[PDB]
Amino acid sequence: RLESDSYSPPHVRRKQKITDIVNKYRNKQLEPEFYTSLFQEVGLKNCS
Amino acid sequence: ARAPLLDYIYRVLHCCVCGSSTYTQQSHYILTLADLSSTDYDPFLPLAN
């Protein structure tokens, strides 16, 4: 594993995956638009 | 879209905590006095100083 040049520790892989998830799935909202998200109920998105 | 009342409340609170200026979207970001007008409510009734 140490000899190869295309290898990184698994936590680096997890960090890169997390960064990719953040980039591809973050929500573009302002500060006032985010507080009101907490109060709104969840779980009925596919039902209502 | 018709934003809920709590949305406008938090917008106004954010404007208070940060500053009156630097927010000139003037469309829906801040609720204005003229928006309150309805059939039986005139927000500009005459008053005597």
UniProtKB/Swiss-Prot annotation, chain A:
Subunit: Component of the heterodimeric RalGAP1 complex with RALGAPA1 and of the heterodimeric RalGAP2 complex with RALGAPA2. Heterodimerization is required for activity.
Gene: RALGAPB
Tissues expressed in: Highly expressed in brain, mostly in amygdala.
Disulfide bonds: none
Transmembrane domains' residue ranges: none
Role played: Non-catalytic subunit of the heterodimeric RalGAP1 and RalGAP2 complexes which act as GTPase activators for the Ras-like small GTPases RALA and RALB.
Descriptive protein name: Ral GTPase-activating protein subunit beta
Curated annotation (Swiss-Prot), chain B:
This protein's name: Ral GTPase-activating protein subunit alpha-2
Main function: Catalytic subunit of the heterodimeric RalGAP2 complex which acts as a GTPase activator for the Ras-like small GTPases RALA and RALB.
Lineage, uppermost ranks: Eukaryota, Metazoa, Chordata, Craniata, Vertebrata
Gene expressing this chain: RALGAPA2
Natural source organism: Homo sapiens (Human)
Full protein stretch here: 1290 to 1338 of 1873
Cellular compartment(s): Cytoplasm
Oligomeric form and interacting partners: Component of the heterodimeric RalGAP2 complex with RALGAPB. Heterodimerization is required for activity.
